[PDB]
């Protein structure tokens, strides 16, 4: 609506910068990584990297450089943000307390200035006299590094050369000297200048070189003793100094564009170079002291590197924007100099498209992204839950139950897993990680076990259909056996350390565990068949209550012991009988859970002495019946719920919560505290027994499905249990006439189809990827020069089939505007993709949306609506000619939101009685727009330049027809990220609505709506938090969030920053009361009483529950 809450669900993963130095101490070697708005600080260790501190800034890090001014014990850090906020930071640590303090700060933006084409360049001279900033054409800003320059005051030196490509400060010079590559009418050249510190002007530099390579783009300052500079172009690498000139152009770099570099050693005898394709090179300066020649060696392949940094021990950090980041080892006499991958780091960006699987389910929905580009392209399956580290797998099918057990009374650790099967029981012994099937004396393999385990007096119990068997630990024999008076088989079995409550049809029986004897104490008949029983002591191993579920009554009731007196009777409702029942305590407060035959779970409070339901609550846990099992996590007790959707039930603020398990269908479970598997669990499905350890806490589980090509669009087709993915791959023209660069998803599919029988070419495909295995089941190749643009998965008209529909465009280098394209309707039946129908359009099909059982498509500047007929053809119903290109298309009801690349918003309405569209409203505001979404019938969200969000609303006032057709700008916010996709979807099961967004940096965020009362409270809260929260670099949050373009800056409105709001939980108790001091809390009556810290702790806590939680950085 008009009031929105925007919060981060996954911080940016893409790496834009990486530096090494000595930040945390003079003795430590650090690795500083910039991930947009975040700075991660690691300590390089012989084994690997150790995370020490991660900070967020109210800015997009544009420059990050470590430096050591004279008199300083360890390095300082210079950061410059995209909004020209400059700062010098220092790492301060007192024991286990870490702060990043601002030594100096200030905004270095100029009132006038044309921002340079090769962007912001920030360089520091070797002597640390100054910071040199190339922000605008014709100017070189200089910030002296004097101790007293705490406001980073600077001066500009006019540069005659207007088009500078790259600049660096040289080494071994008599005064701060810059070296740069520039272009002018006579070509590309290299020039140097001295910075006169007294004059604050440029002086004639030591050397220059006119007419360098047309493509030279990188300046490398070589340190002493040689000094000078290295220039890297497209086909050549050259060295320059006052007198010397070296030039190489080796074939090894002929087909590479080098875009990054790093100095390996302090003498600068070796450099690492990375091209746009993942090749890693080593540039060596060969001495004879003097510098004699240059040599390039191809080391191997890494991820496409944005930045490289040599660490130590031949370990290189590869910072990537298009694929996962890495730690590679350079190995690098016998072999050539080569590289081996050591560690990989998840990078979800760029997220070019995404979709939600299980959106309808309350929570438990996975997000699938089209991530990366080129050889780094992949799908990323993102789900939140508790993971299980599997340690062992046993192929043993048909398991109907698992029980932990201790065959040795002198040991406290379990050493036996007993499993039941239909009409059978097997015993497995554990000797460390060695599982070996054995026989247990006194236990029968003849019958199916309903319960078994350790009981009182150093004994074991085994409850089968035939009988109840007491077994001695030392002698391993059946000391006592209880059987039904008429030999009738048991139907339900419950037991604890000293009590056994067996159910024989409708009649319950209460046996008591005694030394070498099972004493039958009580025998009663219930008014319905017994479906589930429980006697968990909540006591000295004795529970005076018994939970029992019934068939005819369909109720879960709590009875007294040993009197069988009904203390309460609660009717569950419906026609399915219960499956499991459990009495358990969460955070000293008792409960009574009840699982139904249709995966429905009921949870009520249970009075230990009274025996009655406190609150009738229900939570659907799946389709399959649920089996509840108690287990201990730490001091407290948790319950594992086995079904098609396994769940862990726990307490939080004395209230039940339901974290889902990052696992598939689990039928049975039991805790296992073996010597080889301590504090572990056993899980059983239809065919396997798994022994694993459940993770500490809920985190994101990301499955990477590499495609080795670029995924462009994704749709989910539930009926087919698969994904439709538009993808492209680059091929190079071959002599024997085009060919692939490497195998990828579209060339490695199980089955494939085609649309017809040295420069690059894009081959477009439709992949059908299985949703469980992720194998490429099929690949369809589009026509030569045909660009696949849009994709939907839907049912049309009266047709029951679900189709994959693709909108294409014919792309010819000679034609600027697309004049040809088509809509192809595909069906994935059995194992193949069939083309059902095709529709030629006279333009590009930029977008497609299923619209009320019809296909709404935007072709060029028009919006067309198609009907799917019984002859299985798309027949044109109506058209809407827009004065804009219909790039974006979103619909809600009969409304259509149409948008172009320049932020032109058009609102249309399908008139069913007229058979055409009517323009409702519009808004022209030229700015680059990257995505749009409909929030509700009246409000529209969009992402516009530069990294902003905006909300426009159709007018409430309705004064006149002109006011009715004009959209009002009600929200603006500088997000700091570039949104590629918006989609409605549930993350976790006040606020209304959920809109997720995917970005270029791999960040995933959420936009939800607020009431005016909530927005006004949180807006006040932000202004009070902005006075409490310390900002790295002393940047005002309001300046950071202000809507921004190079030309304009307006304050944010209509948006609440959830990342700032949630930081309230991390501030001190006294500071919390300063924040909430004059806040007006509204409980739901208008009576705005004063807000307390506890009111806002509960308010901000439920806000954290609407999105995925962020992981702690440091160990």
């Amino acid at each position: 609506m008009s009031y929105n809450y925007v919060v981060t669900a996954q911080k940016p993963t893409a790496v834009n910068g990486c530096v090494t130095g000595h930040f945390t101490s003079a003795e430590d070697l650090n690795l500083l990584i910039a991930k947009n708005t975040r700075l991660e600080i690691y300590v390089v260790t012989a084994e690997g990297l150790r995370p020490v501190k991660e900070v967020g800034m109210y800015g997009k890090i544009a420059v990050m450089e470590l430096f050591r001014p004279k008199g300083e014990s360890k390095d300082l850090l210079f950061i410059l943000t995209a909004k020209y906020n400059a700062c010098i930071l220092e790492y301060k640590q007192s024991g286990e307390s870490i702060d990043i303090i601002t030594r100096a700060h200030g905004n270095v933006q100029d009132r006038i200035g044309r921002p340079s084409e090769t962007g912001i360049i920030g360089i520091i001279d070797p002597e640390c006299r100054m910071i040199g900033l190339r922000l605008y054409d014709g100017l070189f800003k200089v910030i002296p590094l004097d101790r007293d320059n705490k406001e980073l005051k600077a001066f500009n030196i006019r540069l005659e050369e207007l088009h500078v490509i790259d600049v660096k400060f040289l080494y071994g010079c008599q005064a701060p000297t810059i070296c740069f590559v520039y272009q002018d009418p006579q070509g590309r050249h290299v020039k140097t200048y001295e910075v006169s510190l007294r004059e604050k002007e440029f002086n004639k530099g030591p050397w220059k070189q006119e007419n360098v390579e047309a493509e030279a783009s990188m300046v490398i300052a070589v340190p002493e003793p040689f000094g000078g500079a290295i220039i890297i172009g497209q086909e050549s690498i050259t060295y320059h100094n006052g007198d010397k000139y070296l030039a190489i152009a080796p074939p090894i770099i002929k087909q590479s564009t080098i875009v990054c570099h790093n100095r390996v050693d302090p003498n600068g005898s070796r450099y690492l170079l990375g091209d746009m394709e993942g090749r890693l090179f080593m540039l060596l300066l060969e001495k004879e002291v003097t510098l004699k020649d240059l040599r390039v060696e191809l080391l191997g392949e890494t991820s496409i590197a944005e930045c490289l940094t040599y660490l130590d021990n031949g370990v290189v950090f590869v910072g990537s924007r298009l694929g996962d980041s890495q730690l590679v080892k350079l190995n690098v006499n016998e072999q050539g100099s080569y590289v081996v991958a050591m560690e990989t780091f998840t990078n979800l960006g760029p997220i070019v498209d995404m979709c939600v699987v299980d959106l309808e389910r309350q929570g438990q929905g996975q997000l699938v992204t089209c991530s990366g580009a080129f050889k780094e392209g992949s799908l990323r399956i993102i789900r939140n839950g508790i993971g299980i580290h599997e340690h062992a797998s046993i192929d043993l099918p048909g398991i109907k139950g698992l029980w932990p057990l201790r065959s040795d009374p002198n040991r406290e650790t379990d050493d036996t897993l007993v499993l039941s099967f239909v009409g059978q029981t097997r015993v497995l012994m554990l000797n460390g990680e060695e599982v070996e099937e054995t026989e247990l004396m006194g236990f029968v393999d003849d019958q199916q076990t309903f319960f078994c385990g350790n009981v009182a007096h150093q004994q074991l119990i085994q409850i089968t259909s035939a009988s109840v068997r007491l077994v001695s630990q030392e002698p391993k024999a059946l000391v006592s056996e209880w059987k039904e008076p008429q030999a009738k088989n048991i139907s339900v079995a419950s037991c604890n350390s000293s009590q056994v409550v067996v159910a024989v049809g409708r009649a319950l029986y209460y046996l008591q565990i005694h030394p070498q004897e099972l004493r039958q104490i009580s025998h009663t008949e219930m008014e319905h068949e017994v479906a589930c029983l429980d006697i968990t002591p909540l006591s000295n191993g004795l529970s005076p209550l018994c939970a029992i579920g019934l068939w005819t009554d369909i109720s879960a009731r709590i009875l007294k012991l040993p009197s069988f007196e009904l203390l309460h009777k609660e009717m569950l409702g419906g026609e399915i009988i219960p499956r499991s029942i459990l009495m358990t305590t969460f955070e000293s407060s008792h409960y009574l859970l009840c699982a139904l035959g249709d995966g429905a779970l009921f949870y009520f409070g249970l009075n230990i002495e009274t025996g009655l339901l406190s609150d009738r609550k229900k939570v659907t846990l799946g389709t399959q019946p649920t089996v509840l099992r108690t287990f201990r996590s730490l001091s407290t007790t948790n319950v594992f719920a086995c079904s098609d959707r396994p769940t862990v039930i726990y307490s939080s603020n004395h209230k039940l919560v339901f974290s889902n398990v990052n696992l598939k269908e689990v039928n049975y479970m039991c805790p296992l505290n073996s010597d080889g598997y301590p504090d572990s669990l056993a899980l059983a499905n239809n065919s396997t027994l798994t022994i694993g350890t459940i993770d500490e806490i809920q985190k994101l589980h990301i499955r990477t499905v590499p495609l080795y090509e670029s995924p462009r669009k994704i749709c989910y087709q539930e009926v087919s249990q698969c994904f439709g993915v538009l993808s492209s791959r680059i091929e190079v023209q071959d002599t024997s006439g085009t060919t692939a660069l490497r195998p990828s998803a579209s060339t490695q599919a199980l089955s494939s189809s085609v649309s017809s029988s040295g420069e690059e070419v894009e081959v477009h495909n439709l992949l059908i990827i299985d949703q469980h295995t992720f194998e490429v089941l099929h690949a369809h190749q589009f026509l030569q020069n045909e660009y696949a643009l849009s994709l939907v998965s839907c049912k049309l008209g009266k047709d029951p089939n679900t189709y994959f529909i693709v909108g294409t465009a014919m792309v010819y280098p000679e034609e600027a505007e697309p004049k040809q394209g088509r809509i192809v309707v595909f069906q994935y039946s059995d194992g193949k993709l069939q083309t059902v129908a095709e529709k030629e359009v006279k333009g590009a099909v930029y977008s497609m949306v299923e619209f009320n059982g019809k296909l709404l498509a935007s072709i060029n500047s028009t919006v067309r609506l198609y009907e799917w007929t019984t002859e299985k053809e798309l027949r044109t119903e109506c058209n809407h000619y827009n004065n804009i290109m219909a790039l974006y298309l979103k619909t809600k009801g009969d409304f259509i939101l149409v948008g172009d690349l320049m932020r032109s918003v058009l609102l249309l309405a399908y008139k069913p009685m007229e058979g055409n569209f009517e323009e409702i409203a519009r808004d022209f505001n030229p700015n680059w727009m990257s995505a749009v979404e409909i929030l509700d019938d009246d409000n529209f969200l969009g992402a516009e330049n530069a990294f902003n969000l905006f909300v426009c609303q159709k007018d409430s006032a309705a004064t006149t027809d002109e006011e009715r057709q004009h959209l009002q700008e009600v929200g603006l916010f500088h997000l700091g990220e570039f949104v590629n996709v918006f989609c409605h979807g549930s993350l976790v099961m006040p606020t209304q609505g959920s809109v997720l967004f995917g970005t270029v940096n791999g960040m995933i965020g959420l936009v939800t709506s607020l009431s005016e009362s909530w927005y006004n409270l949180l807006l006040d809260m932000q202004n009070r938090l902005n006075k409490v929260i310390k900002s790295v670099g002393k940047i005002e949050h309001s300046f950071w969030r202000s809507f921004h373009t190079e030309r304009k800056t307006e304050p944010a409105t209509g948006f609440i920053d959830g990342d700032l709001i949630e930081s309230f939980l991390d501030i001190s108790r006294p500071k919390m009361q300063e924040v909430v001091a004059n806040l007006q809390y509204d409980d739901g009556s208008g009576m705005k009483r004063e807000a307390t810290a506890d009111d806002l702790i509960k308010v901000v806590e439920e806000l954290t529950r609407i999105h995925w939680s962020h992981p702690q950085f440091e160990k």
Binding site: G17, T118, Q183, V259, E306, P350, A816, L887, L901
Partner: protein, 379 residues
């Protein structure tokens, strides 16, 4: 045909106006989105585009004294793009800043001749008439929307050093320009070819090919803003399309709109007749340095946006050729009327000397033509 014995710089000088005029070089610009109150000239009916020159001849004492007091101030007046000429209704307009001025008081007849240039677009808040008869408009300055590159936001920092390309000498050059400038399109939802449709440089080059057909004998501006306004003042479009063009705030949308008009509107018809064809776009040529169409004032202070074409059809010629007040020195004019409806379409221009080229041409007034697409704006 070629231009011979005719100085193409002569028409932009407006020598028919008279002797040398005092020139003013100071420049007044009002803040973006600011509210200014600027005087409107009463009988001016033209729709002015920024950068476009407007010659005027004022004879009424209230107009003469209004410009006299305008010279002593910011030299700016408001030119309204009338939505209703009869109802005197206007929603938009352009300021015109006087750059040249001359007074004539020969025979006791005061005449003020001015040359003004369009500066800034605005939105009309209100129109109030003054005691002197001069309307005064309260206007809100519309800002020129300047956008960076489409890629400036999603651009990888490592490929920043590749954003300067070697000098343009070629279809192969444009293929390489697109592939390198829009390489980071791979991080977004759209292809490089889409980003080309919104690239000022590519759009100006597309226009430049068709503008070269009109003026076969590279003086156009480099700034997309200046180029789009220079092209806007040359398109012979009807008043309804010209007001839509003026309403555009971005040079990208303006260049895109101009390319659509140039690719669709290829036949010029009589506005009164509507379906009667006067000339085709193939006949349009630039006799003036400013292009194929410029504003010129007649002896009675009436402004005509005259378009020069090689041949015009379906016109009848009335009167005898006259060189009086001729906007093309060396040519005589003859009134041309539509043969069907007799509406004044423009004039036939005949050369007075046999050594001139072209020996004949047509000057068609913009207000008389209707551009048809032989079988609304588009940005």
């Amino acid at each position: 045909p070629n231009i011979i014995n005719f100085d193409t710089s002569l028409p932009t000088s407006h020598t028919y106006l008279g002797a040398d005029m005092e020139e003013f070089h100071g420049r007044t610009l009002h803040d973006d989105d600011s509210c200014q109150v600027i005087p409107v000239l009463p009988q001016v009916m033209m729709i002015l585009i920024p950068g476009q020159t407007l010659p005027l001849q004022l004879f009424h004492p209230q107009e003469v004294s209004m410009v006299r007091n305008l010279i002593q101030k910011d030299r700016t007046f408001a030119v309204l793009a009338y939505s209703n000429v009869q109802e005197r209704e206007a929603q938009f307009g352009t300021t015109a800043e006087i750059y040249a001025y001359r007074e004539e008081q020969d025979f006791g007849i005061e005449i003020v001749k001015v040359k003004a240039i369009g500066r800034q677009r605005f939105k009309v808040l209100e129109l109030r008439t003054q005691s002197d008869g001069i309307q005064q408009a309260k206007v809100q300055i519309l800002p020129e929307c300047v956008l960076p590159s489409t890629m400036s936001a999603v651009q990888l920092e490592s490929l920043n050093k590749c954003q300067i390309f070697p000098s343009k000498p070629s279809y192969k050059w444009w293929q390489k320009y697109q592939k390198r400038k829009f390489h980071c399109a791979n991080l977004t939802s759209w292809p490089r070819w889409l980003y080309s449709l919104y690239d000022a440089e590519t759009l100006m080059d597309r226009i430049k090919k068709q503008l070269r057909e009109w003026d076969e004998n590279d003086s156009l501006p480099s700034n997309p803003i200046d180029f789009s306004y220079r092209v806007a003042a040359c398109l012979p479009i009807d008043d309804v399309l010209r007001i839509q063009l003026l309403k555009i705030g971005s040079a990208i949308q303006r260049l895109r709109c101009e390319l659509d008009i140039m690719n669709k509107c290829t036949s010029l018809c009589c506005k009164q007749c509507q379906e009667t064809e006067i000339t085709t776009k193939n006949e349009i040529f630039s006799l003036s340095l400013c292009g194929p169409m410029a504003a010129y004032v007649n002896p009675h202070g009436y402004v005509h946006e005259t378009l020069t074409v090689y041949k015009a059809c379906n016109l009848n010629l009335i009167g005898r050729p006259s060189t009086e007040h001729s906007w093309f020195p060396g040519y005589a004019w003859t009134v041309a009327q539509c043969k069907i409806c007799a509406s004044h379409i423009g004039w036939k221009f005949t050369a007075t000397k046999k050594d001139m080229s072209p020996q004949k041409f047509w000057g068609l007034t913009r207000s008389a033509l209707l551009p048809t697409i032989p079988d609304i704006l588009c940005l």
